[PDB]
Amino acid sequence: MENWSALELLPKVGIPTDFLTHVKTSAGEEMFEALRIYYGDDPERYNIH
Amino acid sequence: FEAIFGTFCNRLEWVYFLTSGLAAAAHAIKFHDLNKLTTGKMLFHVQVP
Numbered sequence A: 001m002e003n004w005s006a007l008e009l010l011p012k013v014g015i016p017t018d019f020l021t022h023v024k025t026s027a028g029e030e031m032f033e034a035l036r037i038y039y040g041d042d043p044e045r046y047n048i049h
Numbered sequence B: 001f002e003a004i005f006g007t008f009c010n011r012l013e014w015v016y017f018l019t020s021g022l023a024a025a026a027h028a029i030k031f032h033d034l035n036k037l038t039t040g041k042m043l044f045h046v047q048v049p
Helices: A006-013 A020-025 A030-038
Strands: none
Touching: A020 A030
16 A cells, blocks of 8 residues: 555545545535536546636 | 440448547547637646656
8 A cells, every 4th residue: 555645634634535425415416516517527537627 | 326335323432530540539529619719728737746
């Protein structure tokens, strides 16, 4: 595995998990469509800003 | 008498963009021409190791 892992530090800071299942389910289906249109459906590789 | 024993036509072969090998280098999409004011500004922030 890694030399040192940043993933250990995100929960301590307050940034939860990978955003994959989180922002989808925590959206209430209202933030989900906004994310799909104004942010992107695949945050890896690319994202719009 | 004088004889005619032939009338012939040229059988054309059709060419398509998507069935060509050159198309592999492309990412071809069909879209509306909604007058995008010379949209020559695609700005990218690309992560660098």
